[PDB]
């Protein structure tokens, strides 16, 4: 509506993005443990 | 400077960071494909 709401949304985005990051880190770890 | 301009800015860096996340899930899927 307004900056309180666009800011809550921005927080939830970074939250979800932190989950995506946890997942790419996980896959990297799998790969690397099956080459190194 | 002003809170809205800076709020936009933070939005654009978050969508850009989602495209980076996308690109990394792609490379993972690729090396996942080579290996296994």
């Amino acid at each position: 509506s307004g900056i309180v709401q666009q800011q809550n949304n921005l927080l939830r985005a970074i939250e979800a993005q932190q989950h995506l990051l946890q997942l790419t880190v996980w896959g990297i770890k799998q790969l690397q443990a099956r080459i190194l | 400077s002003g809170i809205v301009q800076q709020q936009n800015n933070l939005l654009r860096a978050i969508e850009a960071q989602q495209h980076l996340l996308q690109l990394t899930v792609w490379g993972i899927k690729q090396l996942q494909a080579r290996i296994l």
């Binding site: 939830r12 985005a13 993005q17 989950h19 | 978050i14 296994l36």
Partner: peptide
């Protein structure tokens, strides 16, 4: 742990989740 299917599953659900929050 995880399977690779479930990983893909989770990547897809967080990607649409962000993608909604970003419109």
């Amino acid at each position: 742990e995880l399977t690779w299917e479930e990983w893909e599953k989770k990547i897809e659900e967080y990607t649409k989740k962000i993608e909604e929050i970003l419109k």
